[PDB]
């Protein structure tokens, strides 16, 4: 998107690409489960935007202990994907007692 004199124009740049992956070994701070907002639209027709990502470590208030790790996902494999190129993966659960959905 160019912005010439407040007069912006949105063109298409298929030449670009994107990189995404999945954390199987669970080495990154699990964020979900905290139930942050910005979930998938509880509705189908409406579209949305993906929330940025940020995590936290051990800290002494305004400062942090050496035992405060540091992470950078760009140190992981990422399915470099260009437009026209699709992406898929697969997952499976494990045994868990059925949520007793009864009175």
């Amino acid at each position: 998107v160019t912005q010439n004199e407040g007069t912006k124009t949105i063109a298409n740049n298929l030449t670009s690409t994107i990189q995404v992956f999945t954390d199987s070994e669970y080495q990154l701070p699990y964020v979900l489960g905290s139930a942050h907002q910005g979930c998938l639209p509880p509705f189908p027709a409406d579209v949305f935007m993906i929330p940025q990502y940020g995590y936290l470590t051990l800290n002494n208030g305004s400062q942090a202990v050496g035992r405060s790790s540091f992470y950078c996902l760009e140190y992981f494999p990422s399915q470099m994907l260009r437009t026209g190129n699709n992406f898929q993966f697969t997952y499976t659960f494990e045994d868990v007692p059925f949520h007793s959905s009864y009175a």
Binding site: E25, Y26, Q27, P29, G66, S69, F70, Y75, F76
Partner: protein, 103 residues
């Protein structure tokens, strides 16, 4: 509660004693038992092969986590070293929770 491992069927307890060497018994008979003995003892080598299992850090903690190391400076008596009298001790206690494992 003293930390460590618990077992429903732990390694056994090893018990030993010196063979009762009855000292000079009375020439003629006596109903009672023998109390006289010969003060004696023994020595030997204790062998104990302990096999061990482990899980090494596979984390992508980008920053150098903390490690445990003898202080790299110059001291009079080296740590865990034998004082000039052979009698050696331990400068400080040591724990394991060192490697910064993501929660």
């Amino acid at each position: 509660l003293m930390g460590g491992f618990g077992l429903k069927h732990p390694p056994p307890q090893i018990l030993i004693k010196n063979t009762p060497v009855p000292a000079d018994p009375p020439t003629t008979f006596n109903q009672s038992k023998l109390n006289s003995f010969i003060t004696q003892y023994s020595t030997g080598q204790v062998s104990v092969e302990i096999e061990w299992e482990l899980q090494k850090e596979n984390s992508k903690r980008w920053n150098p986590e903390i490690q445990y190391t003898s202080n790299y400076y110059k001291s009079t008596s080296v740590d865990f070293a034998v004082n000039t009298e052979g009698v050696y001790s331990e400068p400080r206690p040591i724990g394991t929770r060192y490697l910064t494992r993501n929660l």
